[PDB]
């Protein structure tokens, strides 16, 4: 079954191997050289069937024995190389490297590409299986890697090189040898890997890619990787170590979009301009301008959203106030409150006035002057309800803008003191949400004392815990951590059972967000609380720490906690946990959805009620039928808690979309539930969220490329969802103001282009669905609002933008090389 | 009761064998292990109705309700053609029985005792889609327009059902994809089923016709009934020309039954409410004009043979996974003005890979492609036109 030439070559090779086996000991070298010539000549050819390897496969053991029994010297290696190249085909006990090590060690390019690839794979295997010992044996397996990496670089196997280096765990030669054209491949490779790779390799890859970007001076990309890393130090370093001012301005846009604010000294080129940009003081004016484009500068009223005409006692007024505030958020003008809000507040009764007034700030978001002007009149009312609501309005107005002046600080520290009553929750929450990312020790030291004073009831204590935690989100601040630990220890053994204690562990975990061993230590310290609340706090802190890390083992632990029968606050928390861990990487999100479905199927009411919150968190402001129909199906569930949670999850997932087939579904739900007042309130809130900002804002805690996790937005979303974990008491009752925690996450969905003067540059752009790159062109003229999952690319080469992550505030360079 | 969708795992973006794909698959497997462990653990963790069951007939049967009478008596079909004037027990829900429902009857006395709402014909259940073909729109080269119309007909009316309302225009509830033998007609349905959130329903015209009496019309009734119970839904009828050819005066009984089933189908196409219908057809002239009447089949998408650009795109799509050799040039094969469907291009690629394997080389080449093109196509005199 072998051709004539095939059999002739087989005879030649058999004669040569017989000569090698024979103990001539005087003609081994010519035969070995002939074998090398034939084997490499066959291998270098594109044919995928090296005939010498096929023919010498059976004599592998005999060749090995001959090599073992032959005299040491040059011939030893001169045959070991052949033995290894032959063993490439047949293996099973990791012998190719074993024989190459004692080999000629010649250049790793004469042996085609497949030998290099097998070499890389097997050295990766060895490095993976080796322990901390045998460091002497790890030394030889580095020069071959140094030779391989440039080989792959030249031969377009950038992915193979990056892989091999990852498995080696020493990603140094990569950035040593990267070239100009290699970023578009290696940088994207590393960025994609980081999502699935676990720590500390996550940080290792992030820093490696950051160094790669710095090598050829990709400052915005290095800054994006720094932001990925939870450390506002490399961000300052990269911003400082820059020479161009336009790129610094764009980096300042993106930093302001992020929660980091850098307090530099008066040494940069334009300190005032850069700090103003990073503070986004002009954000209100830019939002108003974008409103003027595609004119939507017309506030709409709660009945307008409801559309009850086609197809006033206690709660519907509050719902109307909420939806009005949501729809007119940040647009300033309102047709029910701005015109005459005093009568509206007065017709509101009970605790409603708090939120009814805070809606004024929500409407006058990012507009300090307008907020002050429209809130001063209501700031002085006989009832402290209106005063506290006004304080919330001012806090909301200040939230989102990092003005160096602190009118919010002054006004609200004036009232931080209980003033002989517990109605300072408004002041505390306003201060928190206003200074979310500030992390000013001034506000920390203003808040921590009032938190424990023998008169701060659990309501105040929880509000201030949320506030301080979201002030120092993800920083592991010793003072805040210690004070919260002490208060948790000393609160009580019985009152902890009552609600509003859920927020102290939230403060802890949110301060220690994305940290790890820090929460391990804090848990070790916190193991002495009690039986019921200790597990709750442990799980909540754990999730608030590994939010977005995608730690499969941790979410497995949380799944076990969910599964164990409790006959269940911690069980409910663990659902939002699973959601929060999966809230990052895209691939795990759908599996988290499958887990949520299976939980809703085989779950007790306790976690059944939590599942909708998990759905909303996993798909916030990304309304897709896959989740919306499940939420609608379970909306009619018998459990009122489940129904309320599902409806609010629908509202959140539809937040800032104005989505049809969701507005209609909400209208039908309201029609069915007209007789249920609590459920009517919930559906009205869902409509308010759906029409939030009349389709100009998103609650997504992901801005850059759906990849950068925004600490402040995550803080707001998680605090709101934890508050709803028990909807009946916290929200369907006295403390309905907890809804306003959404400000930390609310963020406009815009795309505003600028020249190198902070001046708008109306230019046509193409927007469409990402392909991982653009499909379904829907080009318009900037500025253009972008829907979730839709990316924008310039329709023409007229410019030279400063970012490949074009979104939000983008500076455009009028420097095309050739037009 | 809402849609049914089709379970499908996420898509691993990298088609190459790389650590991105390996880690993505590892995470998928991790989550699958989590699901299995959660199940195992949960199902390990875990009088009046007895007399209700006792009163209910032991081997109770399933029949169909007809012309409910009184508040305690009704006419029910035994499911063998016969019907009875049966009574109703207080056990059943009541205020819930409607004609056509699949009620449960005591075996001996034949008295209504249950409602069994979820009664689905095994044929309908099996033709319902559970998996989801892994053919996203990205796999379709060319046919960009056709993709646009199909999305406007079955996708936009669900994702953004405000544009139609804004101008008071009803969505098209029927799209017939007509074309030569193989151009992507079934691919577009595959992609719609993959990417849509609606309950997909595969059917072939040659399946709806059963032998026993009126089971054909009854099965069409059941199919569209379930397509209504679930919503939104997309019913894909492939090779409808099995039933729907030019209606003609029957000379026999089987032909009369076939025409009756086709008429039953046309009747069920007047039950709006959001159940989209996608017909497929190789030869559209044979179809009756009644079906293609512009009130039941709103859109007709022609799937013409691919042009040079479309053929190029198809070739890159179907060779992306192939270790193409640098020597190859993908223009000569395309622009040779000969008929070439997308299926023909896939066959060309497969035969080229097989030719390279026969030559013992894993990398395809220009000569391999030429030989593949020569040996794949099966089927004007020379000089008469220049």
């Amino acid at each position: 079954e072998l051709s004539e030439e095939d059999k002739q070559l087989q005879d030649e090779l058999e004669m040569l191997v017989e000569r090698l086996g024979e103990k001539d000991t005087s003609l081994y070298r010519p035969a070995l050289e002939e074998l090398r010539r034939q084997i490499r000549s066959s291998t270098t050819s594109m044919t995928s069937v090296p005939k010498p390897l096929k023919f010498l496969r059976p004599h592998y053991g005999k060749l090995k024995e001959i090599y073992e029994n032959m005299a040491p010297g040059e011939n030893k290696r001169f045959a070991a190389d052949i033995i290894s190249v032959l063993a490439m085909t047949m293996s099973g006990e990791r012998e190719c490297l074993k024989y190459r090590l004692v080999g000629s060690q010649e250049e790793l390019a004469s042996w085609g590409h497949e030998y290099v690839r097998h070499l890389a794979g097997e050295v990766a295997k060895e490095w993976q299986e080796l322990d901390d010992a045998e460091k002497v044996q790890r030394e030889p397996l580095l020069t071959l890697v140094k030779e391989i990496v440039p080989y792959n670089m030249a031969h377009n196997a950038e992915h193979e090189a990056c892989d091999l280096l990852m498995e080696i765990e020493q990603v140094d030669m990569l950035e040593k040898d990267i070239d100009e054209n290699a970023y578009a491949k290696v940088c994207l490779y590393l960025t994609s890997c980081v999502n699935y790779v676990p720590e500390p390799e996550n940080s290792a890859l992030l820093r490696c890619a950051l160094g790669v970007f710095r090598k050829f001076s990709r400052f915005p990309e290095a800054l994006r990787l720094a932001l990925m890393l939870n450390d506002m130090e490399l961000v300052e370093d990269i911003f400082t170590s820059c020479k161009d001012v336009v790129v610094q301005k764009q980096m300042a846009f993106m930093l302001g979009r992020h929660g980091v604010f850098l307090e530099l000294s008066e040494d940069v080129e334009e300190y005032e301009d850069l700090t103003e940009i990073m503070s986004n003081v002009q954000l209100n004016s830019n939002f108003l301008a974008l409103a003027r484009e595609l004119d939507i500068m017309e506030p709409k009223v709660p009945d307008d959203i409801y559309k009850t005409h086609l197809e006033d006692s206690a709660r519907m007024n509050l719902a109307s106030s909420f939806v009005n505030g949501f729809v007119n958020a940040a647009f300033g003008q309102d047709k029910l409150l701005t015109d005459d809000g005093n009568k509206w507040l007065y017709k509101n009764k009970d605790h409603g006035m708090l939120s009814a007034a805070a809606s004024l700030g929500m409407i006058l978001l990012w507009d300090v002057d307008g907020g002050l002007t429209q809130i001063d009149k209501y700031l002085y009312s006989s009832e402290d309800y209106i005063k506290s609501g006004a304080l919330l309005a001012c806090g909301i107005v200040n939230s989102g803008v990092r003005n160096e002046c602190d009118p919010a600080l002054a006004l609200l520290s004036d009232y931080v003191l209980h003033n002989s009553n517990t109605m300072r929750l408004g002041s505390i929450f306003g201060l928190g949400l206003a200074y979310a990312g500030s992390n000013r020790e001034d506000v920390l030291t203003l808040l921590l004392p009032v938190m424990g004073d023998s008169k701060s009831s659990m309501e105040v204590a929880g509000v201030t815990a949320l506030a301080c935690g979201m002030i120092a989100v993800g920083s592991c601040n010793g003072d805040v951590t210690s004070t919260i630990l002490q208060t948790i220890m000393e609160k009580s053994e019985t009152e902890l059972k009552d609600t509003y204690a859920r927020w102290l562990p939230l403060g802890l975990g949110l301060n220690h967000l994305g940290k790890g061993e820090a929460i391990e230590a804090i848990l070790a310290a916190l193991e002495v609380v009690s039986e019921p609340f200790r597990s709750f706090a442990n799980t909540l802190v754990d999730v608030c720490a590994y939010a977005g890390s995608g730690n499969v083992l941790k979410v497995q632990q949380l799944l076990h906690i969910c599964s164990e029968h409790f006959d269940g606050a911690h069980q409910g928390v663990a659902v939002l946990g699973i959601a929060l861990i999966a809230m990052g990487e895209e691939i795990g999100a759908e599996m988290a959805l499958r887990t949520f479905g299976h939980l809703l199927r085989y779950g007790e009411p306790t976690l059944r009620r939590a599942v909708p919150l998990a759905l909303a968190l996993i798909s916030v402001s990304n309304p897709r039928l896959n989740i919306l129909d499940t939420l609608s199906k379970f909306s009619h569930d018998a459990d009122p808690e489940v129904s309320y949670n599902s409806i609010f999850a629908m509202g959140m997932v539809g937040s800032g979309t104005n989505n049809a087939r969701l507005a209609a579904m909400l209208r039908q739900l309201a029609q069915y539930h007209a007789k249920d007042p609590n459920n009517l309130f919930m559906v009205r809130l869902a409509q308010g969220l759906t029409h939030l900002g009349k389709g100009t804002l998103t609650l997504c805690p992901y801005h850059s490329d759906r990849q950068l996790m925004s600490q402040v937005a995550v803080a707001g979303l998680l605090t709101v969802l934890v508050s709803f974990l028990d909807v009946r008491n916290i929200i369907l009752g006295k403390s309905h103001y907890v809804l306003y925690g959404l400000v930390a996450a609310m963020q406009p969905r815009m795309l505003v282009t600028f020249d190198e003067e902070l001046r708008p540059l109306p230019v046509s752009v193409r927007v469409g669905q990402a392909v991982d790159t653009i499909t379904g062109f829907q080009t318009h003229t900037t500025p253009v609002l972008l829907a979730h999952g839709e990316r924008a690319e310039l329709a023409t080469e007229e410019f030279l933008p400063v970012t490949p992550i074009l979104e939000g505030f983008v500076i455009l360079r009028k420097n095309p090389n050739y037009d | 009761k809402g849609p049914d969708a089709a379970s499908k795992l996420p898509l691993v973006t990298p088609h190459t064998q790389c650590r991105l794909k390996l880690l993505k698959l590892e995470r998928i497997k991790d989550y699958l292990l989590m699901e299995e462990e959660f199940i195992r653990n949960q199902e390990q963790m875990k009088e009046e109705r007895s007399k209700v069951d006792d009163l209910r007939g032991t081997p109770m049967s399933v029949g169909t309700l007809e012309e409910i009478i009184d508040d305690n008596h009704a006419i029910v079909s035994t499911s063998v053609g016969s019907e009875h004037y049966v009574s109703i027990l207080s056990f059943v829900d009541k205020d819930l029985l409607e004609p056509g429902c699949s009620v449960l009857l005591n075996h001996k006395v034949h008295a209504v005792i249950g409602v069994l709402m979820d009664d689905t014909d095994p044929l309908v259940t099996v033709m319902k889609v559970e998996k989801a073909p892994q053919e996203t729109y990205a796999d379709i080269g060319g046919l960009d327009n056709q993709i646009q119309e199909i999305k406007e007909s079955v996708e936009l009316p669900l994702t953004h059902p405000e544009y139609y309302e804004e101008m008071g225009i009803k969505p098209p509830k029927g799209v017939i994809l007509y074309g030569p033998p193989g151009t992507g007609k079934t691919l577009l349905a595959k992609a719609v089923a993959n990417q849509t959130s609606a309950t997909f329903l595969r059917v072939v015209g040659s399946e709806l016709i059963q032998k026993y009496l009126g089971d054909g019309p009854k099965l069409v009734r059941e199919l569209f009934r379930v397509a209504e119970e679930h919503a939104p839904s997309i019913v894909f009828i492939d090779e409808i020309d099995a039933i729907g050819t030019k209606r003609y005066d029957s000379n026999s009984g089987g032909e009369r039954e076939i025409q009756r089933t086709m008429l039953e189908l046309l009747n069920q196409l007047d039950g709006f409410d959001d159940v989209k219908v996608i017909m497929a057809t190789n030869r559209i002239e044979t179809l009756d004009p009644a079906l293609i009447r512009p009130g039941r089949i709103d859109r007709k998408i022609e799937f013409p043979l691919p042009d040079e650009k479309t053929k190029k795109r198809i070739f890159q799509i179907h060779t992306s996974r192939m270790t193409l050799a640098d020597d190859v040039t993908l223009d000569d094969l395309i622009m040779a003005k000969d008929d070439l469907s997308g299926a023909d291009i896939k066959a060309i690629c497969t035969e080229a890979g097989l030719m390279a394997l026969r030559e013992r080389r894993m990398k395809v080449t220009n000569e391999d492609f030429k030989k593949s093109k020569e040996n794949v196509l099966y089927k004007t005199p020379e000089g008469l036109y220049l």
């Binding site: 995928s48 069937v49 496969r57 | 790389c18 013992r360």
Partner: peptide, 29 residues
């Protein structure tokens, strides 16, 4: 001028040309 594949030929075709993680990838799938 057409040949028939051999067992060693096909074994070489399977092993020689493949990225090092092919077997693990197939196993996980």
């Amino acid at each position: 001028p057409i040949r028939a594949l051999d067992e060693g030929d096909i074994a070489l075709l399977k092993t020689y040309g493949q990225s090092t993680y092919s077997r693990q990838i197939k196993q996980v799938e």
